[PDB]
Amino acid sequence: VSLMEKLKWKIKCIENKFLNYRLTTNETVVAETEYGKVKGVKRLTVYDDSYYSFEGIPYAQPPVGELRFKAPQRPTPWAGVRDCCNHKDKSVQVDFITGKVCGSEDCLYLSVYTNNLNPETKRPVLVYIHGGGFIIGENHRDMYGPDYFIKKDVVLINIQYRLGALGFLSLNSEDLNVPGNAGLKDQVMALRWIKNNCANFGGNPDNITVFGESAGAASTHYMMLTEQTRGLFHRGILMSGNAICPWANTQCQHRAFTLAKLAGYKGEDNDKDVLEFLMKAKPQDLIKLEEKVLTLEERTNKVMFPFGPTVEPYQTADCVLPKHPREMVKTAWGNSIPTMMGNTSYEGLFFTSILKQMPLLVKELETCVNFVPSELADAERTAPETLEMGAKIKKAHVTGETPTADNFMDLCSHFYFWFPMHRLLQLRFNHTSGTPVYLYRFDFDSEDLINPYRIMRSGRGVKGVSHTDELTYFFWNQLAKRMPKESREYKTIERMTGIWTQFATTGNPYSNEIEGMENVSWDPIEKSDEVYKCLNISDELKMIDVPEMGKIKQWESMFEKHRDLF
Numbered sequence: 001v002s003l004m005e006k007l008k009w010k011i012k013c014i015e016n017k018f019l020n021y022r023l024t025t026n027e028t029v030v031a032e033t034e035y036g037k038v039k040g041v042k043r044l045t046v047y048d049d050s051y052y053s054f055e056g057i058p059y060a061q062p063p064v065g066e067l068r069f070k071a072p073q074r075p076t077p078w079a080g081v082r083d084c085c086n087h088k089d090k091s092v093q094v095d096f097i098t099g100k101v102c103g104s105e106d107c108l109y110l111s112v113y114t115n116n117l118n119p120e121t122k123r124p125v126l127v128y129i130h131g132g133g134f135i136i137g138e139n140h141r142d143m144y145g146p147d148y149f150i151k152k153d154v155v156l157i158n159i160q161y162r163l164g165a166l167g168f169l170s171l172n173s174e175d176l177n178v179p180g181n182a183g184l185k186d187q188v189m190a191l192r193w194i195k196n197n198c199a200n201f202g203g204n205p206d207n208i209t210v211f212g213e214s215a216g217a218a219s220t221h222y223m224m225l226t227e228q229t230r231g232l233f234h235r236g237i238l239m240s241g242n243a244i245c246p247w248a249n250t251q252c253q254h255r256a257f258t259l260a261k262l263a264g265y266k267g268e269d270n271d272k273d274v275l276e277f278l279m280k281a282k283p284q285d286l287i288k289l290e291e292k293v294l295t296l297e298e299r300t301n302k303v304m305f306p307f308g309p310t311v312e313p314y315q316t317a318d319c320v321l322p323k324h325p326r327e328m329v330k331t332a333w334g335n336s337i338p339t340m341m342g343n344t345s346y347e348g349l350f351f352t353s354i355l356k357q358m359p360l361l362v363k364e365l366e367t368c369v370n371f372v373p374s375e376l377a378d379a380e381r382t383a384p385e386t387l388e389m390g391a392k393i394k395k396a397h398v399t400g401e402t403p404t405a406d407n408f409m410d411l412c413s414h415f416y417f418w419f420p421m422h423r424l425l426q427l428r429f430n431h432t433s434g435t436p437v438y439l440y441r442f443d444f445d446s447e448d449l450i451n452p453y454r455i456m457r458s459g460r461g462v463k464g465v466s467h468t469d470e471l472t473y474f475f476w477n478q479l480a481k482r483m484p485k486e487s488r489e490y491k492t493i494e495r496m497t498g499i500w501t502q503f504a505t506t507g508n509p510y511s512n513e514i515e516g517m518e519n520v521s522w523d524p525i526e527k528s529d530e531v532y533k534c535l536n537i538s539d540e541l542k543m544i545d546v547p548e549m550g551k552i553k554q555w556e557s558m559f560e561k562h563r564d565l566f
Helices: 003-022 164-168 182-201 215-225 255-263 271-278 283-290 296-300 347-356 359-366 384-397 405-429 469-473 488-506 549-559
Strands: 024-031 037-044 050-058 081-083 109-114 123-129 155-159 203-213 235-239 339-344 437-442 533-537 541-545
Touching: 003 024, 024 050, 050 182, 109 182, 123 182, 123 215, 123 488, 155 182, 164 182, 164 283, 182 203, 182 215, 203 215, 203 488, 215 235, 235 488, 255 271, 255 283, 339 405, 347 359, 347 405, 359 384, 359 405, 384 405, 384 549, 405 549, 469 488, 488 533
Parallel strands: 037 081, 123 155, 123 203, 203 235, 235 339, 339 437, 437 533
Antiparallel strands: 024 037, 037 050, 050 109, 109 155, 533 541
16 A cells, blocks of 8 residues: 555656656757747657657746745746756645655746647647646656657647645735735746747647646636636636536635644734745645645535635736636636536546545435535535435435445545536536537546556556546556557547547547547537537447436536525
């Protein structure tokens, strides 16, 4: 458990060291950027492809010292040619295997990849925003390698942004000018850099697609909601997440004091003095104590992370979320670009690790009161309003006589992913105008090719298609290897990067380019279909009604006399 793969991870980080060097070439090139010239280097893949790599391009000022917790400031445009032949490090975070803190505050970088720099005509630009709960993640190629996408004629850009309290501290007093959402404002400025720089790498600035998985999906949705990013891109793909997910959003303004207190602060709960302490502390001490900010009860109520995107307590210079997610769906420019959304066929299997420890988690399901949406439920969660709402949940997911893991994990698929998706689509349908949304369901199961997230649900061996299982067919990671191109895994890489690039190009995810799509006719959802159609992606590709629709609809029935709140 962990120490097992702790040494594994160690003896697979040193691979990535011996393979990264080996796959480096001598072919350097220089591209224009608005801040000055940048030097990249051609790299190779295990499939005998190659691509140009520019890593460590700053899109903002290093947010250190006085810039800590504040909105990003654009960088200093440099003389000469800046080295981008190496990664820069990841935002400060608790690494999943080591367990202790890694990364740096100097993390506001993006990386640009493409198989050809002078291309004949201009390529679609895909911008990937990583997930990780807004508390972990990176654009390092041990985790998100572009090796599969650069088989296609696209420009791929992978961004970083501030995580944890360093990204998402929020304070009421306008005075202190720490409204929240620093990490989302980082994303905004990365997208602004992309808009005005992608042409320098062969990109088409009229054909940008933003996509992300989990917190990166919530992020992509936030970038579709704010008027700050209006017009800055043209398609969005939400993979296992949106901004009205219960975990995508927390009111955290009174949690800074608690963080300060855990770290040694002596003084009041006044924000000015709380800030003066948190500005002086070592970044790693804060990040390691993040752990403990949420209260014992906040956890019962399913608040997942102490700091994250929030409704800002006032709107200044660079605001992005002046209002709650459901309300921004109203005039949001992004409802009017082509969109694809989807989930895996067993998201909640991504709770085995948690559940393993104190299986008491399961008895929750005896009334399911804790999974009632927080906005409908009472603080104690025993108002007859709440016990009866929970009975509705409880019936949709408890299958027989007594609750288990599968019911709990199945319940989690809906609480954290499918139900919010449903709520978003229906809100979207009436804050709208003609704009296709397409649904997929990722249902391809394999153990011969994996990604690191599998050992951070330290599961190994276990079937079903968990949250994050799809990333393996989009991105290279240091646990990957060269599969034979007959294999079901290689074919799935082909299909997934093919569909995503097809969507990025025309706003329509279908083509006869895709072996296996030959019998797929895949149309969007509209305001009126009673039941959602989706492309189910397995060893075969098949259009089907979402199997989850029945459980979704009963979740909707908790709102039968609170319809305004649905």
